[PDB]
Amino acid sequence: MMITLDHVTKQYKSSARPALDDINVKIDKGEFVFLIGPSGSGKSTFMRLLLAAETPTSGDVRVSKFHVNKLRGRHVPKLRQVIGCVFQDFRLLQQKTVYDNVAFALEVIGKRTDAINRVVPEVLETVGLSGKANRLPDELSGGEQQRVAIARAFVNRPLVLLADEPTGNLDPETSRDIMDLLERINRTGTTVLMATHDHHIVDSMRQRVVELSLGRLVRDEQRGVYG
Amino acid sequence: MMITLDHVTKQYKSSARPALDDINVKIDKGEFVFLIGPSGSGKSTFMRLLLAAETPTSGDVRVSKFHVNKLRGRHVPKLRQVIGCVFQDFRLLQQKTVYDNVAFALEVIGKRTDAINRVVPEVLETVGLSGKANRLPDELSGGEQQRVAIARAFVNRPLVLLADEPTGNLDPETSRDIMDLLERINRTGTTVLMATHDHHIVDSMRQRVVELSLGRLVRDEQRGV
Amino acid sequence: MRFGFLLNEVLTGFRRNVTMTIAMILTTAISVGLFGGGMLVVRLADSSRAIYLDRVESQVFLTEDVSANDSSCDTTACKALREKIETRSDVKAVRFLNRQQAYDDAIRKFPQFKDVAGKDSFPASFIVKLENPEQHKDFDTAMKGQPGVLDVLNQKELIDRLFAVLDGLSNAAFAVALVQAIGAILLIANMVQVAAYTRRTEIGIMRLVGASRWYTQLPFLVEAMLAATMGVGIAVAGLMVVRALFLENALNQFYQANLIAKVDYADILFITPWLLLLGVAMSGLTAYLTLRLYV
Amino acid sequence: MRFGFLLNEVLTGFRRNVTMTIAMILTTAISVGLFGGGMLVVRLADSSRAIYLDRVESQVFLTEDVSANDSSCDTTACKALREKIETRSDVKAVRFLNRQQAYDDAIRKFPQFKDVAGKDSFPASFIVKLENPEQHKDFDTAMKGQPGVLDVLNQKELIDRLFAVLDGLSNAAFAVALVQAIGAILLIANMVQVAAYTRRTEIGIMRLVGASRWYTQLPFLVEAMLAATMGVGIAVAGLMVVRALFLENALNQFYQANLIAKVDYADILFITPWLLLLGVAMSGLTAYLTLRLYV
Amino acid sequence: AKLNELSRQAEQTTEALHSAQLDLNEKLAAQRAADQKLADNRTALDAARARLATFQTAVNKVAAATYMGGRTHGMDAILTAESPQLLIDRLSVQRVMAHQMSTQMARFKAAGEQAVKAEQAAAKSAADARSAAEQAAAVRANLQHKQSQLQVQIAVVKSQYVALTPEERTALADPGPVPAVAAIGGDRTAVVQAALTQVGAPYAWGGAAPGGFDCSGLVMWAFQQAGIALPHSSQALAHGGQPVALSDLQPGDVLTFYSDASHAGIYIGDGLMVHSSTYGVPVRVVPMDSSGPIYDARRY
């Protein structure tokens, strides 16, 4: 079938409430869907649930190609290779230059070494991420670490390009600038899961905004607002 | 004696904008000043010049006691007892309770316990934690972890409360319960600082505003929003 | 095979934890060195056994009434027992000895005890050579109370208790080598707990890229594999420099006396493949299991 | 303040590292045990040196007819013999030992004749030291057969050969002990590194609020002092068990051999104040400066 | 008439002297036994001292022999040796020298322990000899006491004696009515065969002379004619022999008389009792109802 998870409750005990109610959801492949969730309730565990780290204790999780619950030693990294993940931290590598930072995720998966040089100009200098790529990342500004962070996540055109708080510590004067970079991937039609809690930031586009209270889904509007 | 800071051109590794061009500010008792600008302004090095974490290459630093440009390392923690600064990790010990953290926040200087415990519950329930101080912090919810560092930040006398990003990545509704907590101690009379970057909180109480863009005081007026 | 990337990623690991790369090699080298320093002791023990086993002579005493009366056995009572046990199977020559010559031969050996020992204390005897000294238990059991024999001295087996003094020190060296090994093996587990802390920023993204379970641990394993290489090399270099500095004033003294094995540098490198494989043995599987049980 | 607060934190630092901090004890125990063993064998060699002669001596003797009578060298035979041997260039000087002083040194050199061993039993000696004790056997044979000399005695030339091997064993123990000691430093240096890595939060917590520098290192040094005391205690227990386990069986016969001196546990207890000094001051020193250039 | 207490105290100290002489016989036997055992224990101690001196010289010379480099343990021979052929010979002679030295030392230790035990036995023997000599002196002390009180009662008995009398007691002429007939048993026929010497025999103090008799003197002087010998102590004649009964009446027995065994007269029978009279007064025959207490009787 297709990308659909339902009846997923890991049932975390030793707590007042597990906040895992086995919610059945149905999401297609396409544009950007926003998960405007409150803090400490349904963000980290939900993001980890499709990240194939903590297995669900009830039901199973399905993706269009693979099975998440049913696996082996070789089934896990094939699922792990086809998903791109963007996080809050910049997580650069200080001991190496920038031009091979995006190439670092290519020799560890079994690609042809000379063929990387046929891919790195197609990936690095694609959309506004040209720069010079031959500087130390310590002396570089903070406004372009996230530009190569999302470049590391998109190197072989994967299916899911999920991002969690791209602005974060960034000022709102330049958050609209990096949003303009974010929507370029959304124009390509690839699946993206964008989860943040920022009022009057992503409310301009009025895309599919969802919310939950205590593990139970309470908002599902395809053109809703946050409030 | 109305002590402030000025000049300071700290170039160090790469000059670019060495610290600040010049500083012409003044302190006040009960003041509350914002600061707004981009990430490249070096505002983190501004606060590090205040608690003597960075020696100024020019000018001097002095907060109400002495010119701290030249001072011995033994006298460096002599003045730190009245300064409170708040962060995002909240510095929470998972193996210690809330009352254990508040007790450890004042135990380190060394005092008789006959007068330590006599002022603990006067400030435990003041912030909003009425009891339940013998609970593990992971069992405590995320909506009050920022309040614990505030509660242990007033175990000594409040003089300067430095604040750089107190809310962080948080819901805006649950930032309203703490923006009045420092206002309550601002009515006591102590001054307090503030460092954010959003503009939604700027047009709320209309306090002193300073801007900074690569070591340059672009605009500051100490009035309005 | 991506060999040049693995060639130069290991240099950052050596540049990171510079205060432990020496200590690990020192403790493994010390742990393997005195463990290696006992097999050659056992070797020289068994080799010095052979240079005395070749010339052990059997000696059996006689009763006094057949020895105090006559020095030479010419009576038929001693001759019948003389001619019966002297050519059976394990004999090459039997030498009869008198009594009076068996008194002053001790005086010719040394002019001591010349006054404190009487003439009437040295029974007559025989000297018998045996083909195999290892099979001594046959004539131990072939000799019981017979009319003319008083006791059996059981040839010359005073050599085993002479050389037994070094078995205790070899056992002590092996025991303290064992306790040094049990105090050294857990450092290999400590390396993986200190090295992963130095590279937390890359192991997380290398986990979520889809890397192989069989290939995620090789940069955490090849340095522990090569750590056992130079450790046994400096261990045998230290063994060379302790043999060539503190034993020439001892072992060379027994050379002209021709009493020891006289080992050298050649047989030391003969046992090196039996120790370098043991050195790389526990460095591998322990390091493999401690990453599987912690990371 | 007082010690009533700090008793918890030493338990927490041990509980968070139950595997790394137990390697701390025993690798120091080996280093102090080898150095304790070297002092023991050096003291034993210096004690047992007094039994035998020096490097230039020839123990000669006299007949009974001139020794039991005329104790002072007064007779015509003694004056002639004490003048003939100094004529040629072979000897340096002659001493004077007679039966008045031939008893007290004998029981000293043989501490088993406290019974009625009698008087007038040990002959006069008048021992002689010479220049070159290398070609002296002809002198010994020349004094043999003299009308008035019983025999001679010389205790050199691979007789005092054990002093060529005990010093070598002590030097080998010192050589491995210094390498173990320098291996110990680069392991105990990582104590503060792993402690700062595992406890990075609170060590920043009293830093910004204002605390004395002198109180910051106090919850780190006491672990190294306690580990040093544990190491020296298990080391001094180690000598107690390793002697009485099997080293007694190889030393008990030596007293009937009377080749070595008498050794008991009190001699090992005499050196324990010197062993407890090292280990707790060197560790305190190397734990002091590693934090001055860290924080 | 009244010369009776003097006679009783004269015979009492006489029998006391007899019993003292009887104790003196085993007294002299006891000191003879002490003297002969003191001859033996000192000779045994002298032999023990001689062999102890011999073994002391024997251990003196073997203590001396080790002083001239007598290294005899055996493992130390590898320092002296320079060839393997010499070393095995050195150990072979070492094994017999150490054995002989051990046997010499053990023999000396056992002989010294036996000599110490024999010296303790000689000390106990000396204590026994000194105690025996002291006991001999103690039983000589009462002996010399009896020798001292010997002549005192002799003077008292001789003060009365035959004197202090009138002629009326001399006019009282009475040799004795009728002596006994004795065992005519049959081994005692000669008791009254010489009775003509009696009936008119005067008294003597502790004497068996033919004419001078006492209570026991008549008894043994008659019984040596029969060939039977008894101790001259009439108090102990009540303690010698089997106790004969009063019912059977056969002659030749003895009979305690004059109260508490102060006169062991022979059995007379026929309602008469021939008892020893005083000095000068002839031996009268008066019946058994003259004294009072008679007590038991024995057989001679």
Residue numbers in the entry:
A (entry chain A): 1 to 227
B (entry chain B): 1 to 225
C (entry chain D), D (entry chain C): 1 to 295
E (entry chain E): 45 to 228, 270 to 385
What text comes from the article?
The FtsEX complex is a widely conserved regulator of peptidoglycan (PG) hydrolases. Instead, it functions as a transmembrane signal transduction system for activating PG hydrolases. Briefly, the ATPase activity by the cytoplasmic FtsE powers the system through its ATP cycle, interacting with the transmembrane FtsX. The signal is then transmitted from the cytosolic FtsE to the two extracellular loops of FtsX via conformational changes, and finally to the coiled-coil (CC) domain proteins.
Next, we used cryo-EM to determine the structure of the FtsEX-RipC complex. The final map achieved a resolution of 3.9 Å. This allowed us to construct a complete model of the complex between FtsE, FtsX, and RipC. The lip of RipC, as well as its adjacent α1 region (residues 102-109) and α2 region (residues 129-148), bind directly to the ECD of FtsX, resulting in a buried surface area of ~1850 Å2. This binding involves three major interfaces that are dominated by extensive hydrophobic interactions, two of which involve a Phe cluster consisting of four phenylalanine residues (F61, F110, F113, and F122) from each of the two lower lobes of the ECD domains. In contrast, RipC is inserted into the ECD domain from the side at a ~116° tilt from the central axis, resulting in an inclined binding mode. When RipC binds, there is an asymmetric response from ECD domains; one ECD domain remains stationary while the other rotates significantly to tightly lock RipC underneath. After RipC recruitment, the two hook-like ECD domains become perpendicular to each other, along with the small loop and top region of TM helices, forming a joint cavity that locks RipC inside. In short, the mechanism of RipC binding involves a “match and fit” process, where one ECD matches and interacts with residues from α1, while the other ECD fits and rotates to lock α2 of RipC underneath. In the ATP-free state, the bound RipC was tilted at ~116°, with the NlpC/P60 domain being well-folded and grasped by the tweezers-like CCD domain and pro-rich linker that is specifically restrained by the N-terminal residues of α1.
